[PDB]
Paper text:
ACMSD, the enzyme responsible for decarboxylating α-amino-β-carboxymuconate-ε-semialdehyde (ACMS) to produce α-aminomuconate-ε-semialdehyde (2-AMS), plays a crucial role in controlling QUIN levels. This zinc-dependent metalloprotein is situated within the tryptophan-kynurenine pathway, where it competes with a spontaneous chemical reaction that converts ACMS directly to QUIN. With the cavity of ACMSD, a mononuclear Zn2+ ion coordinates with His9, His11, His177, Asp294, and a water molecule (residue numbering based on ACMSD from Pseudomonas fluorescens, pfACMSD). ACMSD functions as a dimer, with residue Arg239∗ from the adjacent subunit being crucial for the decarboxylation reaction.
Instead, we obtained crystals when malonate was present in the refined crystallization condition and successfully solved the crystal structure of malonate-bound ACMSD at a resolution of 2.21 Å. Malonate shares similar structural features with ACMS, possessing two carboxylate groups but with one less carbon atom in between. The additional electron density exhibited in the active site accommodates the malonate molecule well, establishing interactions with surrounding residues, including Arg51, Trp194, His228, and Arg239∗. Binding of malonate induced minimal structural alternations. Comparing this binary complex structure to the wild-type ACMSD structure, the RMSD value is 0.276 Å on 258 Cα in total. However, residues within the active site underwent substantial conformational changes to accommodate malonate. Specifically, as depicted in Figure 3B, the side chain of Trp194 rotated approximately 90° to form an H-bond with the carboxylic group of malonate. Additionally, the sulfur atom of Met198 shifted by 3.9 Å upon malonate binding. To facilitate salt-bridge formation with the ligand, the two conformations of the Arg239∗ side chain in the ligand-free structure merged into a single conformation, and the previously missing electron density corresponding to the guanidinium group of Arg51 became visible. The malonate-bound structure demonstrates that the active site’s two catalytically essential Arg residues act as gatekeepers, preventing the substrate from ligating to the metal ion.
Author numbering:
A (entry chain A), B (entry chain A): 4 to 333
Write the structure that this text describes.
């Protein structure tokens, strides 16, 4: 069988629905002109054109059959996170969005699994929504990689991971709200430079802060897009750790030794990069993920892993065996 | 023989010398307490502790003998760039610094080669200093990777590369003045996350802008630290280019096809990363570089390349043959 554990949905939310939370900032879906083109909206302004597989589970199931994807885990589009909003408002938003998700999956719950969002700007609310959404059927949580200037080393965010660790709740960390200023205005550079940097920064924030020394081993956590550039730049991190005490101050072992504490998806779009990723992380900690249905995703889902020269025992863990164990899927 | 083409110096500049350009912003060297520890200074404030190999060519030659480095190409520490200063002031600074460099190399010009800086905030001055410094003995130019929000696609910076291309002047691009805001305050994250991102951004700015379609093939240009994360994230760039017209708008061929237009050093601190780097760039376009004498440099210069399983014909191009041809060294 074949699991795709990285994919997005966006719910059919009317403009009126969105306007009851925040007319200016709550995103909604406009399936207009000829109803296979939509645009995520915000207030009266467009935000991103999207296509119908983002919102239509019946359509999506047929693309899945075409691709050969038995089970697809899917979760919020990051524009739905709402980490800027007032806490209680965002906890209500998260709850709605996660009901939408379970409604999306209900069309075929055996083949469409969902992960939840949480109102991460309030730790108590966020832990509550995580437990409630997993009880209601979500298989885990998807969070953005940072909360403004708080990166994953910040005690609030570490405490959220530790809550999920203590409840067997898995987490997918997705880059979002990208660093950069005004420098990456063309050619989708934020997605090519800032996004992998964001994800590396999140992994290094956990490692170099010594967060894995405090977070129980039971945490199941996965970083999108192969972990960004993390695996390629790891030798540079180890070298810095061996030669500067300020890099060692909170991290008592070589940084590269902490790759037995997390997972990455396989979406690196290159056979040599995949071979290096599996060399660094081990065949047990890479899961097939496509970023479906977005353009910078993998158009032939699983094609990179299947066409590699990894042993077939490795190919089976990545396309299937690892995400069965990680999310608890049959 | 063995060339190390990435290394830094800093001149014995007094505080009084620095204060005649700018007391607050011009950096100077304080070889104090016990004269093998110095600190780069700025005004009355410290900036970075450095050790004597940064400023002492006689000392440096003995470390070179110890390491087995026949020829070392060295260039400014990026804090000496002065890209913020008023143009004419900075052109005078650059000229002084480049005289210092030739004075540094004069102690053994056959084994110490120098690259120059330029006052990149004025294109006419910058082209003039490049030609004058190469005529006086520099083997090329080292520039920072961006000038504020102008990245290498900006016409000013492309015109500077094109000037050097048309005069057979080689260039080393070094990351500096790192993106990030207030998010990377600990554990030297700017050097681990922002620096490789900066260098990838510089390479992608040339490729995706179509600058290599305008810059003559004669340009010899090298990017520090293996090109940052560029080589690992290249498949992700190609995928984006195949699937979004805005990524193609200025770049008429697949981005990965432009790796025959530039060079990288070999400083990636990991055998798998080096193998992938040589797979992407080819054995002809990677040059041994150490970042000597800094802590995040390679402590056993050339040890990574020599201990690899590259063919010995590949090991010879990288440690020696490529930088002989790139800088014109015997
Ligand atoms: Zn995604
Ligand atoms: Zn350097």
């Amino acid at each position: 069988p074949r699991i795709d554990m990285h994919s997005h949905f966006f719910p059919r939310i009317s403009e009126q629905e969105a306007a009851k939370f925040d007319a200016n900032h709550a995103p909604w879906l406009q399936v207009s002109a000829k109803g296979d083109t939509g645009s995520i909206m915000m207030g009266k302004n467009n935000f991103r054109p999207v296509y119908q597989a983002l919102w239509d589970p019946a359509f999506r199931i047929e693309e899945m059959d075409a691709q050969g994807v038995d089970v697809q885990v899917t979760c919020a589009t990051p524009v739905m996170f709402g980490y800027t909003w007032e806490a209680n408002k965002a906890a209500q938003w998260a709850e709605r969005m996660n009901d939408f998700a379970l409604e999306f999956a209900a069309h075929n719950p055996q083949r469409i699994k969902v992960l939840a969002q949480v109102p991460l700007q309030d730790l108590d609310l966020a832990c509550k929504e995580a437990s409630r959404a997993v009880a209601a059927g979500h298989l885990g949580i998807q969070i953005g990689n940072h909360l403004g200037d708080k990166d994953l080393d910040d005690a609030t965010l570490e405490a959220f991971l530790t809550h999920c660790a203590n409840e067997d709740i898995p987490i997918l960390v997705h880059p979002w709200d990208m660093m950069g200023g005004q420098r990456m205005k063309k050619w989708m550079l934020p997605w090519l430079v800032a996004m992998p940097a964001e994800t590396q920064l999140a992994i290094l924030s956990l490692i170099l802060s010594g967060a894995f020394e405090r977070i129980p081993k039971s945490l199941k956590i996965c970083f999108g897009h192969g972990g960004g550039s993390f695996a390629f730049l790891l030798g540079r991190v180890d070298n810095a750790w061996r030669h500067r005490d300020i890099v060692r101050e909170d991290c008592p072992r070589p940084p590269s030794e902490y790759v037995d504490r997390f997972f990455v998806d396989s979406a690196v779009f290159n056979p040599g990069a995949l071979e290096l990723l599996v060399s660094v992380m081990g065949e047990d900690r890479v899961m097939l993920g496509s970023d479906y249905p977005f353009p910078l995703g993998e158009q032939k889902i699983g094609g990179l892993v299947l066409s590699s020269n990894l042993g077939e025992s490795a190919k089976d863990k990545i396309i299937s065996g690892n995400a069965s164990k990680f999310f608890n899927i049959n």
